[PDB]
Design a protein around this ligand. Sequence first.
Ligand code: MG
Ligand code: MG
Ligand code: MG
Ligand code: MG
Ligand code: MG
Ligand code: MG
Ligand code: MG
Ligand code: MG
Ligand code: MG
Ligand code: MG
Ligand code: MG
Ligand code: MG
Ligand code: MG
Ligand code: MG
Ligand code: MG
Ligand code: MG
Ligand code: MG
Ligand code: MG
Ligand code: MG
Ligand code: MG
Ligand code: MG
Ligand code: MG
Ligand code: MG
Ligand code: MG
Ligand code: MG
Ligand code: MG
Ligand code: MG
Ligand code: MG
Ligand code: MG
Ligand code: MG
Ligand code: MG
Ligand code: MG
Ligand code: MG
Ligand code: MG
Ligand code: MG
Ligand code: MG
Ligand code: MG
Ligand code: MG
Ligand code: MG
Ligand code: MG
Ligand code: MG
Ligand code: MG
Ligand code: MG
Ligand code: MG
Ligand code: MG
Ligand code: MG
Ligand code: MG
Ligand code: MG
Ligand code: MG
Ligand code: MG
Ligand code: MG
Ligand code: MG
Ligand code: MG
Ligand code: MG
Ligand code: MG
Ligand code: MG
Lengths: 203, 256, 126
Amino acid sequence: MKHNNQLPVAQLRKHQQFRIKTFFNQAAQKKARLHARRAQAAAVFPRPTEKLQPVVRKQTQRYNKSTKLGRGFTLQELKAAGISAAFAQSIGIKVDHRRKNRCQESLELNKKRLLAYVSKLVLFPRHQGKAKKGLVNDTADTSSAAQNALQTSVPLPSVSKREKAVSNIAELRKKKVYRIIRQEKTNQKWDGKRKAKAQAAAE
Amino acid sequence: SGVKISTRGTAGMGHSAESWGTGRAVARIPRVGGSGTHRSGQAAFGNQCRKGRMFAPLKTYRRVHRRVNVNQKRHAVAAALAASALVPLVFARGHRISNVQELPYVFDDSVESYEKTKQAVAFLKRVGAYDDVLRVAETKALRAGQGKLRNRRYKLRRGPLVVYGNEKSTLTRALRNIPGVDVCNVNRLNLLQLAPGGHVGRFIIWTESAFKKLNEIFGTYSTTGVQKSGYQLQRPLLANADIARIINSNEVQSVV
Amino acid sequence: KTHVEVSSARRKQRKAHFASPSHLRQTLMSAHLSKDLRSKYNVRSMPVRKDDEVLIVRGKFKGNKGKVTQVYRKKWAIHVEKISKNKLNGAPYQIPLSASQLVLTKLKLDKSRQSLLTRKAASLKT
RNA sequence: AGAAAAUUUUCAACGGUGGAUAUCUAGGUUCCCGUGACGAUGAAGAACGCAGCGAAAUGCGAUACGCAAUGCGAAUUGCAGAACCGCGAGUCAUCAGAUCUUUGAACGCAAGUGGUGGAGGUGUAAAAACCUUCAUGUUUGUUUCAGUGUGGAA
RNA sequence: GAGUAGGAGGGCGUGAUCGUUGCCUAGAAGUAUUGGGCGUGAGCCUAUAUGGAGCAGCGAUUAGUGCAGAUCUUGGUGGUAGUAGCAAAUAUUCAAAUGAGAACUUUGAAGACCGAAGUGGAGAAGGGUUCCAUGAGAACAGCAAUUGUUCAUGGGUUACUCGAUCCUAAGACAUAGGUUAACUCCUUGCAAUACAAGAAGACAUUCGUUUUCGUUGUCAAAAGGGAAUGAGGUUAAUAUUCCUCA
RNA sequence: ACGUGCAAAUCGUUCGUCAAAUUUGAGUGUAGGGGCGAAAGACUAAUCGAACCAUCUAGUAGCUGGUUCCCUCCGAAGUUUC
RNA sequence: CUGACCCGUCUUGAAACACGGACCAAGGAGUCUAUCAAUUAAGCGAGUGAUAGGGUGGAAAAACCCGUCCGCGAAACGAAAGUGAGUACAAGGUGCCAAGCCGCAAGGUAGCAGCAUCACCCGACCUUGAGUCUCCGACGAAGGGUUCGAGGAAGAGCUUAAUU
RNA sequence: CUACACCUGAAACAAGCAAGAUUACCCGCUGAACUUAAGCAUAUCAGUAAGCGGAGGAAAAGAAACUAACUAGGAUAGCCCCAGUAAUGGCGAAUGAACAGGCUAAAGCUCAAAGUGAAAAUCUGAAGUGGUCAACACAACAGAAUUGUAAUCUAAAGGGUCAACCUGAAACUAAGCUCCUCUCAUAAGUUCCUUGGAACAGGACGUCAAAGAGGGUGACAACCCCGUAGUCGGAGAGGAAGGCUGGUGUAAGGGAGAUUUCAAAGAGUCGGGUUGUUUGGGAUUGCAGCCCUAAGUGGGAGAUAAACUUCUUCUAAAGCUAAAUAUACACGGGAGACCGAUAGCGAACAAGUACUGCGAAGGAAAGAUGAAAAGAACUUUGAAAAGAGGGCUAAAAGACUUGAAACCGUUGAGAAGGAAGCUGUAGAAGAGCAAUAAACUGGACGGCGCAUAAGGGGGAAGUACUAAUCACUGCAGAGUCGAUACGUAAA
Ligand SMILES: [Mg+2]
Ligand SMILES: [Mg+2]
Ligand SMILES: [Mg+2]
Ligand SMILES: [Mg+2]
Ligand SMILES: [Mg+2]
Ligand SMILES: [Mg+2]
Ligand SMILES: [Mg+2]
Ligand SMILES: [Mg+2]
Ligand SMILES: [Mg+2]
Ligand SMILES: [Mg+2]
Ligand SMILES: [Mg+2]
Ligand SMILES: [Mg+2]
Ligand SMILES: [Mg+2]
Ligand SMILES: [Mg+2]
Ligand SMILES: [Mg+2]
Ligand SMILES: [Mg+2]
Ligand SMILES: [Mg+2]
Ligand SMILES: [Mg+2]
Ligand SMILES: [Mg+2]
Ligand SMILES: [Mg+2]
Ligand SMILES: [Mg+2]
Ligand SMILES: [Mg+2]
Ligand SMILES: [Mg+2]
Ligand SMILES: [Mg+2]
Ligand SMILES: [Mg+2]
Ligand SMILES: [Mg+2]
Ligand SMILES: [Mg+2]
Ligand SMILES: [Mg+2]
Ligand SMILES: [Mg+2]
Ligand SMILES: [Mg+2]
Ligand SMILES: [Mg+2]
Ligand SMILES: [Mg+2]
Ligand SMILES: [Mg+2]
Ligand SMILES: [Mg+2]
Ligand SMILES: [Mg+2]
Ligand SMILES: [Mg+2]
Ligand SMILES: [Mg+2]
Ligand SMILES: [Mg+2]
Ligand SMILES: [Mg+2]
Ligand SMILES: [Mg+2]
Ligand SMILES: [Mg+2]
Ligand SMILES: [Mg+2]
Ligand SMILES: [Mg+2]
Ligand SMILES: [Mg+2]
Ligand SMILES: [Mg+2]
Ligand SMILES: [Mg+2]
Ligand SMILES: [Mg+2]
Ligand SMILES: [Mg+2]
Ligand SMILES: [Mg+2]
Ligand SMILES: [Mg+2]
Ligand SMILES: [Mg+2]
Ligand SMILES: [Mg+2]
Ligand SMILES: [Mg+2]
Ligand SMILES: [Mg+2]
Ligand SMILES: [Mg+2]
Ligand SMILES: [Mg+2]
């Protein structure tokens, strides 16, 4: 232990010889995954690769501003779509029963998604018989033979261009932002003692 | 690669072996206790000893592979191509370009559909390429020493590299068995084929599709590249690389 | 080469060769057919048999022609009549030969042979 | 100039000791991929055997370096004798049917012992000798039973 | 123009990899040199001899990359040195024979020893073919050898009465029951820390039937207990065993 | 005496005891912080004031020893503080 | 003829009556992984760079393209609650001092980078406050510090290789 | 009291199950010291070695008594991040996760518990009958079972009442595909010279190449032989612990939505105390003993102990579950800037062998004649080994490739009065196919053989210039592609 350099942080203190991980399989592994995926396509041929995924906001204050692919559709949403979980599943839709909708907009996105899905759908019944729910589409669709990816057919755009208005500037200029944030933080701070005062002056 | 590690230990460590201790007029090294075998009392595991473990037994997890910044991979491939275009350089590499005409050497897609080998040969012969190919053929070496037992039997110098633009072209099957020929699809190119041995400049034969896509792929000092999606080629340090011109002009000498 | 399952290792192959079980050996030691026979059966090479007539193509004994006395697969040897050398005590001894240095002038003919030949010609011309 | 030899000693050539160097490799080593697939239907291991001439290693088990089936289609070979040209050679391969001594989780009991019980078979005038069979736990049942366990008609 | 500890700059030499230029059955690598030269030096080039299949330069890449030492590892060799030494256990000698050869083998003739507490005749433990016969190059039998406990080839170990096998001992182990994470461990002849555990008979002769009496295992002794054999003869090698007789 | 033995405890003389707490074979009971001991820290397979075998184990070493090619250049410290 | 103790080692001191070395061949000792830093070459620059993974591809584990996040930089000071580089038209002064321009010269002009110093700024700790409102807790015109900070004040980083 | 029934236990018998093996990876336990703190107790090494019990092809884990408090997310597992962060620690040494976010992978299901009570609707065996006969379908008779089998149900519901709209065991009947195993077949010089014992070498003429990977053939062979490539090709045989998809279609079976006096869910368990132990988990990280021992809008959780008010999230105390993940083990495949017989596994070889130890356990050395044995015929001297002749062979290369050093013998040239070697300087002798040397360049002229010179015209190609043309720079019309915090609610 000699010079000005930063205090070391021990690494190999235990017996690591038993505990090392090697990455050469990676090479072949990637490849394997490829073929797997491909062999899925072939065995699934008429149907799409990835099953239908709703969308939500991310779980953290910092992530809220972004968009994320959900695991499943909210029963509430399937209702507004008019699909039973079971059916949606026979369709290739992904359902999640513990998720709940606390916003109108979160219903909207997924409705739009579901509908979009259905509209673009082709359904093969036992040969030459037709059916009703989510319905069933004409025998000629058998010839249509669509191999498609879900991002192409059922996507989600957003562009950041924020529209400008002057009248509002005239408006917004009359308040004071700092003062605001301050008095607010303040209110949250002293709320408890204040309510307690109300209760105490009331009794 | 690495040296045997097993239940017993790193190789050479496979004895229960002691240090006799100072009293015996023998060295302190570990020996093998036991009876009845000539190996008995023989020095035990350590660098010094016949039949012992190495200085630094060599491991699997030695990190061999390195990763290059994309921009520098590209800049490299570029400067390589740049090189491939000047006669002095490819001649300097030892390629035989004498009967070759105009570099870059570009041809029609008539080539891309070649199937049999004979016509790829006839091709090289016409174009005057074949001289270079001849050379790969006339210097063919048995590898010096160990390499042979290691499954590399022959050292062959590199011949002409062709760059085709059509994904489905047969030029591949065509050139295959010709020693020294090298086939590449324009969209993905290797500094490794471009500058074998890190040695800049090489004989290339190009297609039309090849040659044309070159620009879309890379781009130019006006525009970015498409395929490289934002790659800008190197900004020259000196517009003119003749210091001749610059030392020898009016402005220079008036003042000098 | 096109196939990952094809061993390019000196070791593995040499091994295959010398570790060759008898039946495979017969294949491994085989001779080239005469212009005539080549043309007849549309087959380049054939595994040697003990009743065949052959011509030594290369060696101090090149140019000599005769019947195959012994296919000794273990010793890797083919023996040909009158290809022996004489010893000072007056004792004769055979001189062994590598098939791939031989040429088949006349085959021993019989059903199995004909079938083999037939298969070879078959993939060949077709 | 004890200006010869012997001894001691330098250098070279040849010879002798010795097995370095060079060049090889049916070996090792590491990496990636594929299958996990032993056993009371007796495993893994152990003992003793099995070739015309055989110790070992490998194979095999009284059908004993091997039977059968299948594919290759003429050898094995160190010696000797046969067999095979297709009724098919072979120290060939494949392997899906057989053989599988004494043992070993190891099993009637016992064991530094080929010792010794019961039942059945055999053998005999009767024996001897030979042969087959019997371990423990557990889930069902089957059959025969016990209980001052609970009930209980004639 | 000094220099240990130490540091810096250049260079020499060795594998292997990507390049580039080439050399080799018209003889590569390696090896020997009181042949000729090149570097201040790492080192180099050539010549001759040997050798009999691979080599080499240049630019980079990489390193199990340079040894006089560590009582360093493994292997091989010296001087000491034809030296120390081959001296306990009283002893040998003569002739013949055999053999290339005899102080060391075989017969005979002499002289001595162990002196029935043996250098004798047989066993147990331990050894495992060392036993018998014929033959014999090397090695071994610290001199020697024609000889052998050595080498090669063949052949030898017969039982109602000998012993093992049976019995019990000091002891020990199952079963049953209990303990343990589990493995393991605890009890058991005065038999149990267990216990619905057995044996016999007869008819039947299977079962079954039937009857009687009943708590329940095994191993440990080649000197202990312990049903009955002797003499004579025979083989190159076995015999209280084979043969004969009793 | 031998002490590079005949011998990792022997040999010559001499000596203790010699019908008992005598000598001795086999079988059987005791195993490592444990045995076993008329007690010497004795004995426990040439190992004992804690056997032997393998493993953790290349145990740690402020200490001893070694630390492998050339040239050229610069060139020390044995004092301060804790 | 002149000069010439035995090497290696530890030591103030070795030819030492200090230790290792009878001889020879082959073997034989600062590596490998990670970590931070300084320097050198590379790329890009208020950005930089992926990893995982996707997608293609040579016979082949290469290569070639994609890779919404992430790292590290881009803001700091506080234990923390918290605040944030305070006159929108700022980004300074001074002493040393380089280019360019003047001048034969003497010197004159200018003032980049760095060093020293003074000033301003954000935050910690102190101190002070008209007035304002969602008035009991916040806001803020004016005015300050003997102090504290791995900070502002026209961003210098990020990835790669090598050495110590 | 008997017969008999039922509960409980017992024996023999029939049919099936467990007992050991395996080591790399996996599960449940048990559990240290060396070492680091420069001492040393806590700590560290470390839940690590050793030990024990269980598996599998993977294991385990898994459908929330999870996160998070945000415009939330949503099984488990691996990768990347978060991170060397929060935390733990003689706050010393040193320990040290997770949420959010980017990916790989994707999957969800079965029980207990009011409800057959218009009727045990259930499960197991089964002489047997059909069969693809070991695997399937029925089955007389028997057991199990109301101290309860099967249908509904599992909170995402559900019962009850409607109901659009759906489904199909049985039987009958057509055509097919997937995967595995063992076999069989495929280009083109053996032309010519020279050196070789051998041509696979160096030359001359030829060929094939979706085959110039790699091997073997007396030598560094694409073309002599095996192979390689066309070949996820063609042909033949046998397979599925008895692979997979049709068409009619029976008894029967579902249910979006709608409504409704309905709506029921795991106990010595959860929770608490205490004591150990464990985790970063720190006055409630996990677990285990002992002592308490519940509830039913109850009960968990919301990273500080305890009340009290409000909000958030999930339903524990029963079960199943592919994939992405781990594999120093076994049998296979392929490969490598590995090693190359003191290296590489200890073992290239009758290597876990010979050998040693009472035993547990220890454990080596040892690879290359030649293309072919052609392995040395025969003569001679020897008792024999062997020598001398003679011979094989390209060569003895002869128990064997090369054949270094140390050491030893012979032959040669030298040298020495109680050691040797060595820097500097000369000399002598000895050994020699000799590495240095009076040569080289030119003028004029001569003798020889070959070519055609300078100078002059000429002026392809070259360079330089320069209008007309034309790359590039600049400007830039029309088409097609793209971008755009310009613009629109989007267009
Ligand atoms: Mg895997
Ligand atoms: Mg000593
Ligand atoms: Mg060619
Ligand atoms: Mg010599
Ligand atoms: Mg047959
Ligand atoms: Mg039983
Ligand atoms: Mg009763
Ligand atoms: Mg190496
Ligand atoms: Mg020659
Ligand atoms: Mg050189
Ligand atoms: Mg020669
Ligand atoms: Mg180099
Ligand atoms: Mg060396
Ligand atoms: Mg040495
Ligand atoms: Mg000696
Ligand atoms: Mg003596
Ligand atoms: Mg005697
Ligand atoms: Mg005696
Ligand atoms: Mg006797
Ligand atoms: Mg007793
Ligand atoms: Mg007892
Ligand atoms: Mg008796
Ligand atoms: Mg008798
Ligand atoms: Mg005495
Ligand atoms: Mg000290
Ligand atoms: Mg002197
Ligand atoms: Mg000396
Ligand atoms: Mg002195
Ligand atoms: Mg010392
Ligand atoms: Mg990558
Ligand atoms: Mg930051
Ligand atoms: Mg300033
Ligand atoms: Mg009962
Ligand atoms: Mg088991
Ligand atoms: Mg350690
Ligand atoms: Mg210490
Ligand atoms: Mg810990
Ligand atoms: Mg298994
Ligand atoms: Mg990290
Ligand atoms: Mg995530
Ligand atoms: Mg039946
Ligand atoms: Mg019943
Ligand atoms: Mg061919
Ligand atoms: Mg000739
Ligand atoms: Mg040729
Ligand atoms: Mg070849
Ligand atoms: Mg093929
Ligand atoms: Mg514990
Ligand atoms: Mg609590
Ligand atoms: Mg659960
Ligand atoms: Mg001779
Ligand atoms: Mg020779
Ligand atoms: Mg000499
Ligand atoms: Mg003399
Ligand atoms: Mg002298
Ligand atoms: Mg003299």
